[PDB]
Design a protein around this ligand. Sequence first.
Ligand SMILES: Nc1ncnc2c1ncn2[C@@H]1O[C@H](COP(=O)(O)OP(=O)(O)OP(=O)(O)O)[C@@H](O)[C@H]1O
Ligand SMILES: O=P(O)(O)O[C@H]1O[C@H](CO)[C@@H](OP(=O)(O)O)[C@H](OP(=O)(O)O)[C@H]1O
Ligand SMILES: [Mn+2]
Ligand SMILES: [Mn+2]
Length: 275
Amino acid sequence: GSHMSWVQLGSFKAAGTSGLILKRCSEPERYCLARLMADALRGCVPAFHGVVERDGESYLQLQDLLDGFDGPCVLDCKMGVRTYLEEELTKARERPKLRKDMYKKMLAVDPEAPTEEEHAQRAVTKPRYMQWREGISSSTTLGFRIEGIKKADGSCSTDFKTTRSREQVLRVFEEFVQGDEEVLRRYLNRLQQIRDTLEVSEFFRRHEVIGSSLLFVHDHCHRAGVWLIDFGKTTPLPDGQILDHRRPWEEGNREDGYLLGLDNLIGILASLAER
Ligand SMILES: Nc1ncnc2c1ncn2[C@@H]1O[C@H](COP(=O)(O)OP(=O)(O)OP(=O)(O)O)[C@@H](O)[C@H]1O
Ligand SMILES: O=P(O)(O)O[C@H]1O[C@H](CO)[C@@H](OP(=O)(O)O)[C@H](OP(=O)(O)O)[C@H]1O
Ligand SMILES: [Mn+2]
Ligand SMILES: [Mn+2]
């Protein structure tokens, strides 16, 4: 139906127009969505209708991806081997911003994870925190991680911070599709067509794609869709430089492993379909 409906039962506000949603405007994301509407990836991302003012503040006017579905099931998959910008590494060296909450989260998952100095600081840098999150999840090894699942009743989970092995990820998707062969086949067809689009996209070869997700949406009528969302940390490469999006990240090469992630994700869903 609508995302704001699920919200009722952060950055998102109800739109005036049926089948639209408002997302708080960020300059990187507005730049990306404008380019994407003119790119091969146009159909792989939510429709971007421009910017509107509400309570004297700027919102992206977006397609509500849940609008076509009857009681949608949603899964958010964060794509990439790296989940922070390289500029965040520089700032953390020259001008660190210590984070006490991020320290507490770590203790909880692994008490021996923080160093003697982080313990004494009771705090860590964001990039250190994001690197640790990448290693305890599937991000480092598979190039994606499950962030959360939602359902139209209000029922939601984000309890995936240690979902890491290929088989752990497969078991989350197995539970998400609840044995619906038609939804799984449609998800796999959509991912195959997205991969093909990414591999020819002018936008994609010219941009570092960090912190974006693939949003999986399906319903009990067997409707299934997948879209790329969240371009808040997607930045152009300089001087017409390009990425392959599969090779390992090494500080300075700005590689995101996005397609390593999509290759693995397709392989897991193809595996699930043969079980
Ligand atoms: N166009 C859309 N239509 C419907 N639901 C959407 C849309 N975009 C995002 N959502 C929902 O909102 C969630 C958050 O989206 P997104 O990642 O863009 O926002 P964010 O505020 O940057 O979140 P985060 O910091 O968790 O990445 C998605 O996982 C999905 O449930
Ligand atoms: O544990 P979760 O909720 O996934 O949060 C973490 O992951 C978010 C992205 O999903 C980060 O956001 P961003 O890097 O801006 O995309 C967030 O960072 P911050 O605390 O807002 O500075 C970080 O604490
Ligand atoms: Mn996001
Ligand atoms: Mn964001």
